């Protein structure tokens, strides 16, 4: 049913593009006990800052010290400088972008690949991004709902890259008859 | 649907991953290749397996008193020269 | 830290530091008193964990870790076919 | 029978006197009253004349020490809590996962999708190519071959196969790590403490572990002083037997907080249904005692160095 | 051919023993079943080893 195909393949993407910019943008990655602001409590860390909770001084927190065998070093610049996770948010914006400049310069039924390629490419950037965090991590604990956040993103992200190569295809059907 | 380059070097992937594969060979010749490979794959693949048991095993087992250090005579000991430490060495009773 | 070297085994004979003084010191009777007073008050032990504990420089499953590996390797492949499909 | 009595023996030998054995008929060890400054036990005995010496378990303190004469401790000790050991633990539901950690399997789940849809775009995207890998047959083949299972279709172009070479490779190494840390498996405190309220634990009436928390000022002991003190009914009991059994008849529900010394004792004897748990809260050591002004309390210091020196005590303990 | 009964029979046993299918379910429901087989085929085995 073509027509509904595009706004569910809109909404989505928009949807993707905010829980991937929220997960990013938030510091509930991981509940872990350590030091707040330079005793040990609880702390809601994240990507950027790992942020302090039930303590003397809860709400105080600061910037994650990424760093303290050339592998180890690379892996820290990675996870130091979330890449992954920031490339998987330039991503899916430029196919949002292209999905709704598929309404103007229409006929081209040639962008819209393109923007099923980025959602794709966006959800492997995402899950390489997981991995790294995951990996980094282990140099009693738990993930925040913005670690799921990140999750959901990469799965409706697939969706939709699903959703626009499934268009592309039946337009070029359309065309051939 | 015949071996060609690209499908032989399929086939042989995949009969080196043990997934199974969408064609065989139907000659004489080609089952001998096929079956060499097959019994290469067995051999290199259970030893994969083997191996990888056998490292985590051990690591997951891992000298440690004066006696043992008595008998070894290769590794060398000392104490400060004035103390309770020489001076408990020196008044011991004990074999070790 | 440097952290090079470790313990092995556990303690041969077991003794404890004693403050000393000549015999008839004034001192002797009093700090015997000071060291039980610091002992109950607990004020040894904060002294031992600022010295000690404040100086700090130092089966079971598999982890992402034991195999991330394969999982960049099948990421990266899943982004060379992609490449090849769209030269093509 | 015993340890204290051979420790009277040695030290009687080394000192060269005699001794008799005698008990207390309180059963106590001993303590001291803030209101009447009374002195019970085997310290209200020794102070009060009925007696000259005590070779027995007694804990050094300042208290002690202001009204008798210790000598220098015969063995180390430290509080300690006792507790119900818990029973063994069955494998479980849904524990055929744990050869691999959460992650992994999270992630095996995340590059499932997308290894699908990475198959998916690539064998049906160009209109040159209309492969019968639409979205569903795609999940079935990578499911398939996670499962090392039948795959009745297989890539036929260049990047379809470059898909499946890796997702093979990639099942490979996590199917076979799977198999051989199943072998690994198949062939191998007190702040806890005071917060749960629901689990009750008690001391000795008249003792040093029963001042030494009345006299803390520590959050976790003094936590614990206030529970005690208002732990009706009174956890506290008169003898160590009595809350050996308290701890033994309670299903896990009742600690004991007591010398080290007697759960090593206890733990290696049978039934052996309790152990010692965590640390020891203060560290102190028994020490034999004698009143003011005896002409033991000289010799009994030099009987027990030399005691200690020679290794009789680690003998006797051992 | 489809899945009958004998051929059902075989399809299971064949997935059990890891020794390949000729055919496979290709419905939604089959496919049910035959995840479910494969998984359960998967683990059992690995114990057996």
Not at chain 1, 117 to 129: E, H, R
Not at chain 2, 57 to 85: H, P
């Amino acid at each position: 049913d073509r027509g509904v195909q595009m706004l569910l393949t809109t909404v989505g993407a928009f949807a993707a593009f905010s829980l991937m910019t929220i997960a990013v943008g938030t510091d509930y990655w991981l509940y872990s006990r350590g030091v707040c602001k330079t005793e040990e409590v609880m702390t809601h860390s994240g990507l950027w800052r790992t942020c302090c909770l039930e303590g003397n001084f809860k709400g105080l927190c600061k910037q994650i010290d990424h760093f303290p065998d050339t592998a180890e070093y690379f892996l820290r610049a990675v996870r130091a400088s979330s890449i992954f996770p920031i490339l998987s948010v330039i991503l899916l914006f430029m196919g949002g972008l292209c999905i709704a400049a598929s309404e103007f310069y229409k006929t081209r039924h040639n962008i819209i690949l393109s923007a099923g390629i980025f959602f794709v490419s966006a959800g492997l950037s995402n899950i390489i991004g997981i991995i790294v965090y995951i990996s980094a991590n282990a140099g009693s604990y738990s993930y925040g709902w913005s670690f799921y956040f990140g999750a959901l993103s990469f799965i409706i992200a697939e969706m939709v890259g699903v959703l626009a190569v499934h268009m592309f295809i039946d337009r070029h059907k359309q065309l051939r008859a | 649907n015949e071996f060609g380059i690209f499908n032989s070097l399929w086939f042989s992937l995949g009969a080196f991953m043990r997934q199974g594969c969408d064609i065989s060979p139907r000659s004489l010749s080609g089952r001998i290749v096929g079956g060499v490979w097959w019994f290469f794959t067995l051999i290199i693949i259970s030893s994969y397996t083997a191996n990888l048991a056998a490292f985590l095993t051990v690591e997951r087992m891992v000298i440690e008193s004066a006696e043992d250090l008595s008998k070894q005579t290769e590794i060398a000991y000392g104490t400060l020269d004035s103390g309770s430490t020489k001076e408990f060495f020196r008044r011991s009773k004990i074999a070790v | 830290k440097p952290c090079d070297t470790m313990k092995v085994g556990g303690n041969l004979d077991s003794k404890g530091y004693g403050i000393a003084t000549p015999k008839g010191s004034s001192l002797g009777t009093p700090v015997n008193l000071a060291v039980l007073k610091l002992s109950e008050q607990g004020v040894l032990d904060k002294l031992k964990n600022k010295w000690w504990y404040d100086k700090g420089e130092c089966t079971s499953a598999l982890s992402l870790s034991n195999v991330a590996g394969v999982f960049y390797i099948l990421v990266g492949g899943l982004g060379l076919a992609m490449l090849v499909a769209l030269i093509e | 029978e015993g340890y204290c009595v051979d420790l009277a023996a040695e030290i009687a030998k080394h000192c060269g006197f005699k001794y008799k054995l005698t008990i207390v008929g309180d059963g106590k060890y001993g303590a001291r009253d803030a209101d009447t400054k009374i002195w019970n036990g085997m310290v209200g005995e020794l102070v009060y004349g009925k007696a000259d010496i005590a070779i027995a378990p007694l804990t050094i303190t300042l208290v002690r020490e202001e009204v008798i004469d210790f000598s220098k401790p015969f063995m180390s000790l430290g509080i300690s809590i006792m507790i119900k050991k818990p029973q063994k633990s069955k494998p479980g539901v849904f524990s055929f996962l744990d050869p691999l950690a959460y992650e992994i399997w999270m992630c095996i789940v995340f590059a499932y999708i997308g290894v699908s849809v990475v198959l998916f775009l690539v064998s049906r995207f160009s209109p040159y190519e209309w492969n019968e890998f639409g979205i569903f047959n795609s999940l079935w083949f990578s499911l398939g071959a996670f499962m090392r299972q039948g795959c009745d279709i297989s890539p036929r172009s260049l990047s379809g196969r470059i898909v499946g070479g890796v997702w093979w490779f990639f099942t490979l190494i996590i199917i076979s790590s799977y198999t051989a840390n199943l072998a690994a498996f198949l062939t191998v405190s007190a702040e806890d403490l005071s917060k749960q309220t629901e689990i009750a634990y008690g001391t000795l009436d008249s003792g040093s572990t029963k001042e030494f928390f009345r006299r803390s000022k520590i959050a976790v002991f003094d936590k614990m002083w206030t529970y005690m003190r208002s732990a009706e009914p009174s956890v506290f009991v008169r003898t160590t037997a009595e809350g050996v059994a308290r701890v033994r008849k309670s299903k896990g529900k009742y600690a004991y907080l007591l010398e080290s010394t007697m759960n090593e004792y206890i733990e290696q004897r049978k039934p052996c249904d309790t152990m010692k748990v965590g640390g020891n809260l203060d560290s102190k050591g028994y020490g034999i005692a004698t009143p003011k002004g005896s002409s033991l309390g000289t010799p009994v210091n030099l009987a027990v160095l030399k005691l200690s020196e020679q290794g009789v005590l680690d003998k006797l303990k051992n």
